[PDB]
Amino acid sequence: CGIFAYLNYHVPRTRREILETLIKGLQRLEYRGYDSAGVGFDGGNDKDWEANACKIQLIKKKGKVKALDEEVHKQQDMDLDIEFDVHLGIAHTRWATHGEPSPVNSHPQRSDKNNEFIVIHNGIITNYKDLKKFLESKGYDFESETDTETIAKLVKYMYDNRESQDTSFTTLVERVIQQLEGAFALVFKSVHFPGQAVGTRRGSPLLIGVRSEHKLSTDHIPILYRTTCLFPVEEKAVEYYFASDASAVIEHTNRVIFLEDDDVAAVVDGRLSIHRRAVQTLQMELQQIMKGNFSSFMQKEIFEQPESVVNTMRGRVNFDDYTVNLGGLKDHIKEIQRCRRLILIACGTSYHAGVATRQVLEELTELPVMVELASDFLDRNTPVFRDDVCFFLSQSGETADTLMGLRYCKERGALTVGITNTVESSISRETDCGVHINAGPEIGVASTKAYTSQFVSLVMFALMMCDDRISMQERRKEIMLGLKRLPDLIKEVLSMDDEIQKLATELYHQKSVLIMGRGYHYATCLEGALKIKEITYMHSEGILAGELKHGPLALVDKLMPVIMIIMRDHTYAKCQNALQQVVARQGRPVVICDKEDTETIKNTKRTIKVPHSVDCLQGILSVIPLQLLAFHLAVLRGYDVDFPRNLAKSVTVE
Amino acid sequence: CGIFAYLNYHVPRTRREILETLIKGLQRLEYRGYDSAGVGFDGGNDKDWEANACKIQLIKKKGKVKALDEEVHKQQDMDLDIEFDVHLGIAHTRWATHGEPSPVNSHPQRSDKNNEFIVIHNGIITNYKDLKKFLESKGYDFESETDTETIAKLVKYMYDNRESQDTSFTTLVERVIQQLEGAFALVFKSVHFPGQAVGTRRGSPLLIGVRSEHKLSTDHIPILYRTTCLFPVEEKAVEYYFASDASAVIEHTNRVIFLEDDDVAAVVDGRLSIHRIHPGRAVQTLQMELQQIMKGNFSSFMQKEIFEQPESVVNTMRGRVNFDDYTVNLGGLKDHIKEIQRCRRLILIACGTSYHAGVATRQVLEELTELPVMVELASDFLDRNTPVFRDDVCFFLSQSGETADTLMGLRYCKERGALTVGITNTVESSISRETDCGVHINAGPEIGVASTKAYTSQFVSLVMFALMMCDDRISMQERRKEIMLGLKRLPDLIKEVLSMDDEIQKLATELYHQKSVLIMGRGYHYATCLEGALKIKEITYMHSEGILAGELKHGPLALVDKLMPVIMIIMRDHTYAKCQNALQQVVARQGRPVVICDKEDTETIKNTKRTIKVPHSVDCLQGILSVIPLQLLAFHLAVLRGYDVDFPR
Numbered sequence A: 001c002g003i004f005a006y007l008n009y010h011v012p013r014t015r016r017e018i019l020e021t022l023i024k025g026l027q028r029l030e031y032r033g034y035d036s037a038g039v040g041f042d043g044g045n046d047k048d049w050e051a052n053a054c055k056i057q058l059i060k061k062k063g064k065v066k067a068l069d070e071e072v073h074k075q076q077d078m079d080l081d082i083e084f085d086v087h088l089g090i091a092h093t094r095w096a097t098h099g100e101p102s103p104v105n106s107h108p109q110r111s112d113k114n115n116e117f118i119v120i121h122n123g124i125i126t127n128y129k130d131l132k133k134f135l136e137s138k139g140y141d142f143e144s145e146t147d148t149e150t151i152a153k154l155v156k157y158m159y160d161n162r163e164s165q166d167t168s169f170t171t172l173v174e175r176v177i178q179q180l181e182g183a184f185a186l187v188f189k190s191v192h193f194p195g196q197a198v199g200t201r202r203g204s205p206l207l208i209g210v211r212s213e214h215k216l217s218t219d220h221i222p223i224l225y226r227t228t229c230l231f232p233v234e235e236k237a238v239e240y241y242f243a244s245d246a247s248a249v250i251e252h253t254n255r256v257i258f259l260e261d262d263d264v265a266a267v268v269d270g271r272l273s274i275h276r277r278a279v280q281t282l283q284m285e286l287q288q289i290m291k292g293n294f295s296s297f298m299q300k301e302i303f304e305q306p307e308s309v310v311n312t313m314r315g316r317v318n319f320d321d322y323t324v325n326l327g328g329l330k331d332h333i334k335e336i337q338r339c340r341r342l343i344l345i346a347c348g349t350s351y352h353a354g355v356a357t358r359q360v361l362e363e364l365t366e367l368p369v370m371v372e373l374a375s376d377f378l379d380r381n382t383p384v385f386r387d388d389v390c391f392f393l394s395q396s397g398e399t400a401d402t403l404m405g406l407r408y409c410k411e412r413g414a415l416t417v418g419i420t421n422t423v424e425s426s427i428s429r430e431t432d433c434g435v436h437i438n439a440g441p442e443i444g445v446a447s448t449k450a451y452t453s454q455f456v457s458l459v460m461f462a463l464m465m466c467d468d469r470i471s472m473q474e475r476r477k478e479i480m481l482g483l484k485r486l487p488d489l490i491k492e493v494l495s496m497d498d499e500i501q502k503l504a505t506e507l508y509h510q511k512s513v514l515i516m517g518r519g520y521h522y523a524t525c526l527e528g529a530l531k532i533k534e535i536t537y538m539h540s541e542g543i544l545a546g547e548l549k550h551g552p553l554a555l556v557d558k559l560m561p562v563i564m565i566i567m568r569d570h571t572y573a574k575c576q577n578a579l580q581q582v583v584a585r586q587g588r589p590v591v592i593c594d595k596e597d598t599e600t601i602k603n604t605k606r607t608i609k610v611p612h613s614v615d616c617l618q619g620i621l622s623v624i625p626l627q628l629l630a631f632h633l634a635v636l637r638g639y640d641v642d643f644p645r646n647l648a649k650s651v652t653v654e
Numbered sequence B: 001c002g003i004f005a006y007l008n009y010h011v012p013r014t015r016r017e018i019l020e021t022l023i024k025g026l027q028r029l030e031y032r033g034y035d036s037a038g039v040g041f042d043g044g045n046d047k048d049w050e051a052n053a054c055k056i057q058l059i060k061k062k063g064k065v066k067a068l069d070e071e072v073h074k075q076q077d078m079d080l081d082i083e084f085d086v087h088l089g090i091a092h093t094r095w096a097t098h099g100e101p102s103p104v105n106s107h108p109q110r111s112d113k114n115n116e117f118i119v120i121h122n123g124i125i126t127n128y129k130d131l132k133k134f135l136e137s138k139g140y141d142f143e144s145e146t147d148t149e150t151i152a153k154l155v156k157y158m159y160d161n162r163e164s165q166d167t168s169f170t171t172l173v174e175r176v177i178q179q180l181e182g183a184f185a186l187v188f189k190s191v192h193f194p195g196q197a198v199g200t201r202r203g204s205p206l207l208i209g210v211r212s213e214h215k216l217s218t219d220h221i222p223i224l225y226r227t228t229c230l231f232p233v234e235e236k237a238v239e240y241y242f243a244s245d246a247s248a249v250i251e252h253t254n255r256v257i258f259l260e261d262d263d264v265a266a267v268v269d270g271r272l273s274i275h276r277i278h279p280g281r282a283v284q285t286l287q288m289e290l291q292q293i294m295k296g297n298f299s300s301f302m303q304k305e306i307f308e309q310p311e312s313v314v315n316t317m318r319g320r321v322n323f324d325d326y327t328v329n330l331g332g333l334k335d336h337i338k339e340i341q342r343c344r345r346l347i348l349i350a351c352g353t354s355y356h357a358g359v360a361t362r363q364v365l366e367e368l369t370e371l372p373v374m375v376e377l378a379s380d381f382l383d384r385n386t387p388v389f390r391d392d393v394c395f396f397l398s399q400s401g402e403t404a405d406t407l408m409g410l411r412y413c414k415e416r417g418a419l420t421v422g423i424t425n426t427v428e429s430s431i432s433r434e435t436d437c438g439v440h441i442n443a444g445p446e447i448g449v450a451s452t453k454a455y456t457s458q459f460v461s462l463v464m465f466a467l468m469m470c471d472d473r474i475s476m477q478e479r480r481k482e483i484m485l486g487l488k489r490l491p492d493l494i495k496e497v498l499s500m501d502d503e504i505q506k507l508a509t510e511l512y513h514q515k516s517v518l519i520m521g522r523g524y525h526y527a528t529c530l531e532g533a534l535k536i537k538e539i540t541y542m543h544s545e546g547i548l549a550g551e552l553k554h555g556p557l558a559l560v561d562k563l564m565p566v567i568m569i570i571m572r573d574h575t576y577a578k579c580q581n582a583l584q585q586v587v588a589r590q591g592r593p594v595v596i597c598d599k600e601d602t603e604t605i606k607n608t609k610r611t612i613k614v615p616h617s618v619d620c621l622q623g624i625l626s627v628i629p630l631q632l633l634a635f636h637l638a639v640l641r642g643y644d645v646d647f648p649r
């Protein structure tokens, strides 16, 4: 899901300029959810804007943001020429994992038929049933099946039972959050508090971006408890930007305030305070969240892996003297080496990054390495000990299951390490240490550069662990020479784009495809099969090549598409046996192999020839063809690679 | 692939009776698969059986034993009524590796056009190229494209170049295997050693059954190097059954000797000795009956081994679970359970369905041992050179006990000093022998192509081990009671699941025309999804895939629409609510799944159209009940589609 709100204070904006900023804010957040959307703003057509704050208008529609943008426009009642000197608009794209993605279930949710209170919510209220029964007994009727509605019906209940005639908007929200359970990131708007916004969170991201041509009073808002607020000094002109993601705010400003749990932020009279701290400068650049010259974000993020790989190693690898220094681990690396086991915990593609680096981690650390799916890790109550080092791989740093695993391991005294791509995420904060893979914002739902950057990051960690072993010095040099050559070799793989598109035209009409690999390329066939599932909707399954003889080989015939990965490492001969078994079953497989593997290239009709690299790095090169293959298969089938069906990016809830 | 030989010594048999025995022996070996078969016996029609030992006849044919049996009873100039007081007949079923299936390539292979030496072989001689060249340079002409023929030619070379006139048959075979490389199970017969048999193995099973109405000289045959042998005491009558599988012996006798690598067993003057280059080979009693390898009233071995799972689960627990005082005792682990309890990690290593048996019990093992439990695919385990340590307990799950990758993982772990434990279903298999200890799951022989009873018997065996590991913990007494009471009720609950066969058949009709099916579960039923999807792959040849329910929203949920068949497993355990979310996620995307749920789950049944309702059991045993409907689904789909469930692919 995604949250965005635009508050202009004495910065005159027409009703058209405000709605465009709300839609433009959702378009930046659409990748977090695109099953429905909605906006909230003041209605009325009075030339005097002050006589319009008492009327709230809601425009919600099922579909992507482009469906809501069309609903906002070509409306016969809303005059888009009214000028608002002060106004508050809220918007929200929704990932509907349950029920229907109808306008009634979209946000903002309202408290009554006159829209006295509207709220946009990211998360789940684990006790909305009790709140619904209670509010229903007090004479409040509901209209939707969402847990968010109990928040709107409750802020009005606190307002309808206020002791004093001038109870601040903050007070009401405080009494609400005290009755809510679970997680939530809320942005309230009420007719009784014109132009005032309240932003609180508890386990859900929420930041406030501020812009103002005038000097700001301070750069470190103090927290209050039941010379204090952030506001322009000499003048009133100021703009605020509530958002659950920094991508929607960077285009307007790079000055944001990262709230924290129970921090109730409020904007009253154009002054921002936080009840119950810093004002940071973001290092993100607008160009990082733009497609540029690519038609989709996924294709850009695939083709920019030569640069993102370099950025992951920038300032961390030194090829002149073959040294590796991860600044985020300097004050912990020595104690990590005294531990006795490594546990890698993640979901989806981030879990595949652990499968892909498990072998080199075992080799260079000589420690047991256990890779776990976070959901299953929690179901089993896996044993964890004080001398365990637990890694948590999360591009977003907010994945619920991975985050719960983190807190599970922390309670048991394990050393927790983060491999994240979001600085102010829950996982990067709550881990004792970690590495920001510095891949850059990932907009495509399917992770591409995050996987390769996680791969490289875990390799760099492995190179630090063995930097004191004489017997492994040459092995480190071999690997670090590969990392030096890796960007150019990735470019060579991307130059085969056309050749991979031709193969896509041979498979797009197929129902299934089996992707087979072993060793360093087990993760490759799992990740390739997952990417094809996600964006092409073909039934692709990754099969460990050594397991074919134990049953799955019965699926192979001349009709079943098969992709095989055969690289020049120590498993080459075993991979040749698997290929021979497939051919014996009349399979006609596409083989991803090494350029110099003349034997495989001679006896196979369709081959994808990637350049040779170090065995523990070849997985980076062998997965990119499957990233591209999934891309071209989706185009041929007429799907949108950026917005696959049935899901969105980052699973921040159950 | 299948070896069988019958040696009657002073037990008169007619040629008809001898041939019927050989054929019946091969009938017990057909289940392994083969492309040809053959028998070797004494030719000639001299009323005196002694003048016929210098003539060996071969009858080999590409096809099935039925065809071979027809060939035997169609030969002219061969009188079947001749009575042999002493005779050695050998038989073979071949799975071709070197050379196409044909009579010349079929076994027994001969040493020359007069059949001075004949041999039957299971395995591959990796250096048959060099051997064939050497023999050809010495004037020996080959006729087949098989590696086996080099063995028959080589034993004659050793005979033609023997130093003394009375060099034993053993000596010749000893000099042959010294020059052989690879894996083999061999049985030799020669006109120069009438009535004598020699058997040897290296990495291939070979055993000898013995029967006699007279007292045998010993039950432990001592070894001899280059009282002393096995034989009836006061009389000569005795029968020997060389075989590569006890299935061909058990109907005649349950007293068998299992050979080991480089043993050379010989029968000379009706007396069995074992030579190498005090230790000896035991004459043990097999707890195996013919009815365990016969279909009976079932139409296939798959159906039999699925529907007899109430009985195999009981056999797995017999003598090991005391429901009177609720204790668990695995005899095979008595002299190791206390050392196992001092180790710090469990590692389960296996392939295929045996691996799923570890996934299915990982959680309860973690719960009751409180130790880390790591479940490894054997092939990947070897590729990574997984770190193993002296205080690791490594388990090796194998129905057959001969799976190469699981066996090589065993030897890898033994090198690292780990304590090794076997969970096997084959006595005297490589994995059971070479592990420090283990448990024979006692499921009975598995004749079907796919693991059915073996999986559920491995499941139960691993649960029993977990119950031993926590038998000293006061805090877990109640949990152990709950589990053991579930093991008590488990056979009847299996019968309850099998009584829903009709409902499973209706589900097979709905999927009859389907090309894919997603099977979704989590927790205790993750393995159920993987195992069910494997059987449907292996038996029905459709693209069934197991998906961890918790991973749906991370990508795979995109496959859900109104056309993709989906089976979901939703039981009443601590993941019930999480499974319900998965169901809502699928339904919301127009998926209409079939649900395997508890018999009493009223909410799920009313909101879902087709539900397979299984009885409720303890959470760590429900995986046995939730997997059987998928076993039956695989069975019925294959039958519907005209496939032979007992035919390997």
Ligand SMILES: CC(=O)N[C@H]1[C@@H](OP(=O)(O)OP(=O)(O)OC[C@H]2O[C@@H](n3ccc(=O)[nH]c3=O)[C@H](O)[C@@H]2O)O[C@H](CO)[C@@H](O)[C@@H]1O
Residues within 6 Å of the ligand: A315, A326, A327, A328, A329, A417, A418, A419, A420, A423, A427, A428, A429, A431, A432, A433, A434, A435, A436, A437
């Ligand atoms: C401020 C910052 O972000 N990084 C600084 C650091 O990068 P540097 O790469 O050294 O530090 P990282 O970005 O990796 O992580 C910053 C801090 O967050 C912690 N952490 C990170 C990820 C995680 O999942 N869990 C976790 O606890 C790290 O332990 C570390 O203490 O030197 C570089 C110099 O050009 C710059 O990038 C920055 O001056």
Ligand SMILES: CC(=O)N[C@H]1[C@@H](OP(=O)(O)OP(=O)(O)OC[C@H]2O[C@@H](n3ccc(=O)[nH]c3=O)[C@H](O)[C@@H]2O)O[C@H](CO)[C@@H](O)[C@@H]1O
Residues within 6 Å of the ligand: B287, B319, B330, B331, B332, B333, B421, B422, B423, B424, B427, B431, B432, B433, B435, B436, B437, B438, B439, B440, B441
């Ligand atoms: C094979 C055998 O004769 N088992 C007898 C044994 O069963 P019991 O249940 O006592 O022991 P098992 O049959 O399971 O195993 C027999 C021996 O082989 C070892 N082993 C087994 C499997 C394995 O994978 N690795 C391994 O090393 C065991 O540690 C044990 O020393 O006593 C029972 C009577 O109480 C008899 O009915 C069984 O016939």
Ligand SMILES: O=C[C@H](O)[C@@H](O)[C@H](O)[C@H](O)COP(=O)(O)O
Residues within 6 Å of the ligand: A346, A347, A348, A349, A350, A393, A394, A395, A396, A397, A398, A399, A402, A445, A446, A447, A448, A530, A531, A534, A650, A651, B553, B554, B555
């Ligand atoms: O292409 C698949 C997606 O990238 C998906 O698998 C994703 O990796 C997880 O749903 C959560 O990943 P993070 O924990 O890294 O956010």
Ligand SMILES: O=C[C@H](O)[C@@H](O)[C@H](O)[C@H](O)COP(=O)(O)O
Residues within 6 Å of the ligand: A549, A550, A551, B351, B352, B353, B354, B355, B397, B398, B399, B400, B401, B402, B403, B406, B449, B450, B451, B452, B534, B535, B538
């Ligand atoms: O239906 C599949 C088979 O049962 C298969 O998966 C089998 O489990 C392994 O190929 C080897 O198993 P064993 O090591 O137990 O013989």
Ligand SMILES: N[C@@H](CCC(=O)O)C(=O)O
Residues within 6 Å of the ligand: B001, B002, B093, B094, B095, B096, B097, B098, B099, B105, B121, B122, B123, B124, B125, B146, B147, B148
């Ligand atoms: N390798 C031998 C024997 C194979 C077997 O039956 O196992 C052959 O092909 O004749």
Ligand SMILES: [Mg+2]
Residues within 6 Å of the ligand: A428, A429, A430, A431, A432, A433
């Ligand atoms: Mg931190």
Ligand SMILES: [Mg+2]
Residues within 6 Å of the ligand: B432, B433, B434, B435, B436, B437, B438
């Ligand atoms: Mg043993």
